[PDB]
Amino acid sequence: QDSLPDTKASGPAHSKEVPALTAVETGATNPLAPSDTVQTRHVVQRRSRSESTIESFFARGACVAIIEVDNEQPTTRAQKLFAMWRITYKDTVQLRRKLEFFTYSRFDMEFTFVVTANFTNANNGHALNQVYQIMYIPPGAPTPKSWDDYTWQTSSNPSIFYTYGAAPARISVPYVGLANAYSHFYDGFAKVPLKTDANDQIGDSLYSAMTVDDFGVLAVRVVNDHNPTKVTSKVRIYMKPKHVRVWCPRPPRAVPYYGPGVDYRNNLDPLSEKGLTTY
Amino acid sequence: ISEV
Amino acid sequence: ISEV
Amino acid sequence: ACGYSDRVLQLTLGNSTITTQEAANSVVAYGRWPEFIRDDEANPVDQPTEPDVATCRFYTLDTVMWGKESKGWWWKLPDALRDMGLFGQNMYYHYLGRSGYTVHVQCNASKFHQGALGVFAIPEYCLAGDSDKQRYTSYANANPGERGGKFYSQFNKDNAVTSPKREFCPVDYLLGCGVLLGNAFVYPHQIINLRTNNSATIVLPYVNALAIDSMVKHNNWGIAILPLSPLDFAQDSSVEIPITVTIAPMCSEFNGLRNVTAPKFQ
Amino acid sequence: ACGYSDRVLQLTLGNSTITTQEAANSVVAYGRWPEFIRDDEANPVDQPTEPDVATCRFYTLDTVMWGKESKGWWWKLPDALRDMGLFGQNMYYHYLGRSGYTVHVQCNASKFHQGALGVFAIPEYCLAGDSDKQRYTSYANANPGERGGKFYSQFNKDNAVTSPKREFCPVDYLLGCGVLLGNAFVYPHQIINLRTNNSATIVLPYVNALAIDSMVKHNNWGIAILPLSPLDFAQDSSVEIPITVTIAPMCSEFNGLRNVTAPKFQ
Amino acid sequence: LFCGSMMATGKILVAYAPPGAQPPTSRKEAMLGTHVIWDLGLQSSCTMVVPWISNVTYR
Amino acid sequence: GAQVSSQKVGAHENSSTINYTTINYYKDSASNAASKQDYSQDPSKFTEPLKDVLIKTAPALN
Amino acid sequence: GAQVSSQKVGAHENSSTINYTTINYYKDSASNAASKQDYSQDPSKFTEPLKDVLIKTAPALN
Ligand SMILES: CCOC(=O)c1ccc(OCCC2CCN(c3ccc(C)nn3)CC2)cc1
Ligand SMILES: *C(=O)CCCCCCCCCCCCC
Ligand SMILES: *C(=O)CCCCCCCCCCCCC
Known about the structure:
Chains D, E: It comes from Poliovirus type 3 (strains P3/Leon/37 and P3/Leon 12A[1]B). This is part of a larger assembly, with one copy of chain A (279 residues), two copies of chain B (4 residues), two copies of chain D (266 residues), one copy of chain F (59 residues) and two copies of chain G (62 residues). With 4 residues, chain B is mainly β.
């Protein structure tokens, strides 16, 4: 049973108990109910808070990235034959705001990949079905310079081999934090400037940033050799936190995000105009 | 099995 | 079954 | 019995005692009293230093004056205390240090004065900056020590790309961090309403995602004091009363001793 | 059993470890291991500070060079350690402080070198002065800190009445104090005889007529190192080997905390 | 490991300073942190343990 | 190793406790679905962080 | 013929031993997945291949 407290039949009052009065200076919120300030009937409560549990609130796959990758003839200039994405929930705003209702979090992460593709050019013949390779490159491991170089051999890095048309790719990731909890906010620095330093750049750092590569990257490529005609593709990444726990509540972001930290720039006017005595 |  |  | 009260307190730590004849009970942040790192939550293996009464005592910071134009004040912890006697020494001679705190904020006036101070204790108080540049506020400007910082009424952007101030720009109604001030009450707080109380007493545990961390690289708590209701007196338009912040470390323990850290605050 | 020895020691205090493969057992001064002030011998009533591993560890002082002309070296305790990390800070921030110590003196050479160092630990080591003037040695000159002082072979009196040096004149065979050196063995001691041992280890209790006193006004122990037999090697007339003194505070406790003492060593 | 001749003697300070301060340039500064004073003799070699002292649970 | 539990029935068909079965296929617990049987707690640490928590009918400031 | 064992739970949901079930479908054991419940051993054969293994506090060479 998970229903909320029943309402009590409460009656008339003439006493020296004054629950309606309090003092919010103390830091506390008055634990009042209708039966303290008005006559109430007995209501048997069936309503429950089941959808607002920390798990139910986050239990939904959110889009956090769109990785664009092409399969075309390797020419001699800047191309997208392979792509890399620093894993994060911050490129998007929606999940970012929900997780940021809290300072600390601990959870397992589910990743679901929706791959879509299309023809770029009106017509150079067609393409046989493409297989995609998503490789996780943890910090330290060699990053690919070429779409078919040796790093894609993937002997120890986790890789997904997705086939176009198949049900969207899906995997789970454990709680991989270097600490007892993921910090959604870090009031600090990774380096400190010492008086004895040679230049003042040695000890300089980005405020609120911790590790440089934080969790690593996802590298994406079409394993297929190029067709005559080009195929452009998009790997959409959906993120869902499961087996979730959260600490220290924070106010929701009220102005538009300006980068990874708490920085604001514009649209600092969130509230509407409404008259004091207007309903 | 395990029945709760 | 076999439960360890 | 005898005649005891919610408004009359005595705080005694080490060789220091505070008395208040007009308090508003006291807040224990998140319901947790400060404590030492337990063996089953321990991580550095070296025997810690616990200076007890020589570091866990009441340090009074430089007084600030509240006046009709005052927009707000903010401090970071442990930063506010980096130069406070043997605490600061222990903090800079060791790589690792944890601490809880008792914050006691002081503001008295008269039955004829008026105004309400919002005293806020915030975990990980990340503030917004100067510029177009993201996460660019310098260590020196992020950490004012005892002097603390101030809030502003609007976002005046640091315009000079050539020689940037690399400072914070904390806008009051956005709590200096992109959210609205009215919701700061989800954080551990008290209100100094001048008709009700001279002071606020918030006790703080060590809050962090680690059992212990670098106190020199990282602030755990931020203290924000924003006037929810402006100072007013009789009809004298330039009224001015002192706000004094007194802080004490609690259950302080240190790990990883070596030579002293000398940061560049220049 | 296994193969243990009187000459092979390991001293471990805090984050510091000393190993010696050629020691001469170890002396515990007057048979008393260092200890804390007992409640029935207590006198200041305020709760003491006990910094444990952060102050009770091995501080190595600047090395001195022993050579054919070397007459002797001397240090005072706690003075030698006044600037040693968190110990010095605790010493200057409190009116009262007591401490025991482990003194470890280091001098190695070769089976072909020769000489004998007399390592002496003396309670209340009062030295003689410069002048015609009695008890005129200045605080600044009485206390060399880490640098220590030296002995001389004869009494050369500071002659200039107009601008007096106000220094000590410690004559070696008079132990710098009016008595004969051969009798200094009634004091806690060891001998570094180069054919026998690299080092000497004297453990020291707090000795005083009070349970605790001002460490800044008063030295409890003096360390005197006089060559009983001169350094000699092969036939090279200007031989020279290093003598390194490493000291650790023990059972350190402090009373009467207030603002830091800044002495004038100028 | 001292690979010198048996007639050679010496005493060496070897140290570890946990992060956050100036990297040691002098024995005086190195003294202050975790350390072993090695004395050369029949036991040819000396072990210094660098103890896990860290803020994060994994580096 | 099958796990069996009661569904919280909302709209009841014209036919009482109805159950559902769950089995974990993977060794790593991160691979598991969400159990969603989540217990709750008091607002208190947040709604009343007070050292002397007082009764709602007595004066807040005494 | 079902095999049942305890998962080592890392991040615990707000809901204790959780199990997983395994069944082999093939006769040839090579066809099987990896059990991954692997026991360990001493470094000793490598870190101390000595005929007279000595105690760390006693002189290495006596
Ligand atoms: C510090 C703020 O950021 C976070 O809190 C936060 C951000 C991202 C998080 O995701 C976990 C990190 C990685 C670890 C592994 N990973 C993988 C692993 C394998 C594959 C095929 N694909 N992705 C991708 C995600 C977890 C937490
Ligand atoms: C406990 O689970 C024993 C009962 C198992 C009943 C048969 C289950 C058939 C499916 C087995 C799943 C194996 C997954 C790796
Ligand atoms: C032991 O395994 C007996 C219990 C079997 C439960 C039903 C399993 C259904 C799947 C059978 C798999 C056959 C594979 C060749």
